[PDB]
Amino acid sequence: RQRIRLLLALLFGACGTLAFSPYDVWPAAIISLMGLQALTFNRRPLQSAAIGFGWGFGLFGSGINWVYVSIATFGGMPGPVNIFLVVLLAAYLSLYTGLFAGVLSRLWPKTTWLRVAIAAPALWQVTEFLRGWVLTGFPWLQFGYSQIDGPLKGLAPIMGVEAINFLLMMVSGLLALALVKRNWRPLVVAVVLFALPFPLRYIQWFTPQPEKTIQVSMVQGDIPQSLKWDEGQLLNTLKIYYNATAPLMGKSSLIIWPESAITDLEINQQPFLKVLDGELRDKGSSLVTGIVDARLYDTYNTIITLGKGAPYSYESADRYNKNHLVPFGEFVPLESILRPLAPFPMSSFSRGPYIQPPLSVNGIELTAAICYEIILGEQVRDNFRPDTDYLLTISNDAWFGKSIGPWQHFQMARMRALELARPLLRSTNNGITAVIGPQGEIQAMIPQFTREVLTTNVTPTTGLTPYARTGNWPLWVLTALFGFAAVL
Ligand SMILES: CCCCCCCS[C@@H]1O[C@H](CO)[C@@H](O)[C@H](O)[C@H]1O
Ligand SMILES: CCCCCCCS[C@@H]1O[C@H](CO)[C@@H](O)[C@H](O)[C@H]1O
Incomplete structure (x- = not known):
């Protein structure tokens, strides 16, 4: 019994x-x-x-x-x-x-x-x-x-x-x-x-604002995880993303690259970022991308900003740093040839601020949250601002391919959009890339395990929810x- x-x-x-x-x-x-x-x-x-x-x-x-x-x-x-x-x-x-x-x-x-x-x-x-x-x-x-x-x-x-x-x-x-x-x-x-x-x-706690409707594109790179951080992958990655990004540059007001899409240090990518930024401000587009930053020896998992209404600078504030780390961990994966030898010293992360201002970009406000952070309803809520036009999250869910893990993450991400009545822009490496409505609905989505861009129209929204307030x-x-x- x-x-x-x-x-x-x-x-x-x-x-x-x-x-x-x-x-x-x-x-x-x-x-x-x-x-x-x-x-x-x-x-x-x-x-x-x-x-x-x-x-x-x-x-x-x-x-x-x-x-x-x-x-x-x-x-x-x-x-x-x-x-x-x-x-x-x-x-x-x-x-x-x-x-x-x-x-x-x-x-x-x-x-x-x-x-x-x-x-x-x-x-x-x-x-x-x-x-x-x-x-x-x-x-x-x-x-x-x-x-x-x-x-x-x-x-x-x-x-x-x-x-x-x-x-x-x-x-x-x-x-x-x-x-x-x-x-x-x-x-x-x-x-x-x-x-x-x-x-x-x-x-409906929100008001659509069709006057601020834009074309958004999110590049789903689909860099294989095992290679993602190899010195010999870096340039094929920068080419994959730049070239996905180029034919959209006059048409998509806003473009996102997923978590640490640029797999190298910002300061080591200064010429690439400056040229990319220059071409962007010329064509009238904007870029949001993952990348890593070692600042003076603290290493941050980071979103930086480039392009129209957001000129790039290693000294700019228009950046976000991941706050929530796993109680151990959050290091940069080693080189492939170095990963079998390790058991026989890695760089670990420092935390960004619990509260970080929206990213400003092409006159858009973005309340960002990296990867796992998007499941922390409270933290997202605190970083949220009345003037915030969109929720941003970028992740690399390739660690668990074909599992339910990615889908569980996705689902919990939708709930941020529903909670705060803002559309959510969800950009992933291979994970579930999607645009979610101000009520948690899936407005647009692309298949996983594909190199592909999501391109669609997005309408931001304004006004607080009770939960936003309290x-x-x-x-x-x-x-x-x-x-x-x-x-x-
Ligand atoms: C024809 C019905 C005869 C059973 C009447 C009382 C059964 S006994 C009763 O039943 C509950 C559900 O089974 C249990 O959770 C509980 O611990 C138990 O004491
Ligand atoms: C600050 C660095 C500026 C570097 C300028 C390089 C622009 S190269 C780029 O070339 C493409 C090739 O088809 C053209 O389609 C596109 O219009 C042009 O913007």
Whole structure:
């Protein structure tokens, strides 16, 4: 009955994964969650917390193993070592689901509406907050993101994605209750609470501005990862990108190269950047591109700016530096010939400012975020400005090809657009390159694993959202209310 349960927690946990992309099955989030809620019924604190652990291990285990595809091909570690690192990651994250189920069974032992719809959402908010906070965090696989093409999307520009996580744990809980006690009362309250925001799906917190419509192009280079940083790749890369960029120079007002597309130091690319900038300002176009900067011996993962209304200068401020690093790591991959020899000294990154002004470019304001940073809703929100015309993010997702990793990243990126009511310009090396609407919709997209340019028209938008104005604290107030009430 119990062991049968645990096998079950693993199963409902892995059922969690199918809510996210590329599966896009959003009710699987509810099923997964009420799986957790219901399976934690009728058991002692510890056994329960172990069930929570098994649930989390189902989820993260089925859902972020793609980290392997990175560390195994590009770390070079034995093999069993890699698999160990992955299973350890999943398990570590499942400590949190266990802390959730733990404190839940300890402080609220009986199968009630109190437990499923008042305790669990507040507790889950704090345990997920922790999961995303401790050790710089890893807020990956939050069920709210499944609602991006789904109803409930309305909540996000009001109180953010975490409010959708809240509402989903609540609703799923009441369904768990309704189910195991065969009582229609929790079911009814579930359906009501789930359906209240459906009309929020149609509020437009923003105003289109067709007068500022432009042609945008994003060059998807598709430099193979293994080579990407070889001294003998550099020029084929600069040629690939320059030549993709050249026939658009009179027609596309704005062009983006993805993360560290220019795979060399800025100061070592001064002549190329100056000529490119000169040709750009002549033809009337603008460029935004990834590149690396070693400043005086601090090394920054960087976006720089060139072209019309944005003349290049190594001393310009119109630049962005990546803020969020993995608690270890973020180095520059070595030369191919040097990667097998390493186990038998790399350059690591320094952090850019938590708050960095928009990039200015051709009279466009761009709130930038590099790669992973686009999943940090709060940080993006803080860097966001009322005058911001677009969200910018550039990434290299080639570390995990063909995995679900890229699609999960993409999905979470859409939520920034929805949250802040701005279009999102998403440029990738081989990853998912796309233009996302001010409501998280995918306006334009190009296939991955292709060398290709995305070219389309984009219309920026203005005006704040409740979530733009407030950020997290209304949901935090709701949480504190719920939790302090939850101590009865
Ligand atoms: C014909 C129905 C007979 C069963 C009535 C009470 C069964 S027992 C009850 O059932 C719940 C769901 O199975 C469990 O979660 C709970 O721990 C258990 O005590
Ligand atoms: C500051 C450095 C300026 C360098 C000027 C080089 C411009 S070369 C470039 O050549 C292309 C070849 O077809 C022409 O189509 C394009 O119009 C011209 O801008």
